C-alpha cells in the first residue's frame, strides 16, 4: 500500500542515482501547496521538515522516508506541475471527533532526477488521475493522509 507515485520515484532513484461539498478553489490551493512542498522536500534544498506541515500518517511517513533517502544518496528532483484540475472535492464526518475530505484531481507533471555524477539525468513526464484523502487536524488546517493514483497515461 505505497502512496502516490512513490514507487516510480524509488525506482528512478535506484536505477539512476456527513457529506458536504468542498469549494473547488480551496481543494485546488491545497493540492498546489502540497505540490510545492513536495517539490521543496525533494528539491536541491531538501526541505524534509516541510512535509509535516501538509502531510500526516502514511503520506508523511513514506514521503519523509523518500526525501531522506534522496538526500542520503546526494540526488535531488526538479518537479514541474504543468496542469492541475480538481474534479471532485467533498468533506464528510470521520468517526467520533474529526472531519475527513476526498479530492479527485487530474495532474500533469514532469520530473528530472538530478545526478551530478552523470551527464544525462533521468526524466519522466506523466498525466495521471489521483485521489487524496485528507483529515482536518486538531488545529484548523487539513493534512493529506493517504493518496492513490488511479489512472496513469
Closest by CA to 33, choosing from 138, 141, 146, is 141
Q: CB-wise, 45 or 65, nearer to its own copies?
A: 45
Alpha-carbon gap, residue 76 to 78, rounded angstroms: 7
- 141 binding its own copies? (CB under 8 A): no
Q: Which of 61, 85, 123, 152 binds its own copies (CB under 8 A)?
A: 123
Q: Which of 29, 53, 94, 148 binds its own copies (CB under 8 A)?
A: 29
Q: CB of 28 within 8 A of CB of 86?
A: yes
Q: Which of 7, 14, 20, 32 binds its own copies (CB under 8 A)?
A: 32
Q: Which of 111, 133, 134, 145 binds its own copies (CB under 8 A)?
A: 111
Q: CB-wise, 11 or 116, nearer to its own copies?
A: 116
- 71 binding its own copies? (CB under 8 A): no
Q: Where do the DSSP E strands lie in the chain?
A: 20-21, 76-94, 98-114, 122-136, 142-152
Tell me if residue 134 falls in helix, strand or coil.
strand
Alpha-carbon gap, residue 86 to 81, rounded angstroms: 14
Q: Give the binding site for its own copies (CB under 8 A).
A: 28-29, 32-33, 36, 39-40, 43-45, 78-82, 110-112, 114, 116, 119-121, 123, 125
Amino acid at each position: 500500500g505505497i502512496v502516490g507515485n512513490i514507487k516510480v520515484l524509488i525506482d528512478m532513484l535506484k536505477m539512476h542515482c456527513h457529506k458536504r461539498p468542498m469549494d473547488t478553489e480551496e481543494a485546488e490551493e491545497l493540492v498546489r501547496q502540497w505540490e510545492n512542498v513536495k517539490a521543496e522536500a525533494l528539491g536541491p534544498t531538501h526541505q524534509v521538515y516541510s512535509l509535516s506541515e501538509v502531510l500526516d500518517e502514511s503520506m508523511l511517513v513514506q514521503w519523509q522516508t523518500l526525501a531522506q533517502t534522496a538526500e542520503a544518496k546526494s540526488c535531488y528532483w526538479r518537479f514541474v506541475l504543468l496542469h492541475l484540475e480538481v474534479l471532485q472535492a467533498h468533506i464528510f464526518e470521520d468517526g467520533i471527533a474529526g472531519e475527513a475530505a476526498e479530492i479527485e484531481a487530474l495532474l500533469e507533471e514532469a520530473a528530472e532526477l538530478v545526478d551530478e555524477s552523470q551527464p544525462k539525468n533521468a526524466k519522466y513526464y506523466s498525466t495521471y488521475k489521483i485521489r487524496y484523502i485528507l483529515k482536518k487536524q486538531e488545529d484548523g488546517l487539513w493534512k493529506f493522509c493517504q493518496s492513490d493514483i488511479q489512472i496513469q497515461k
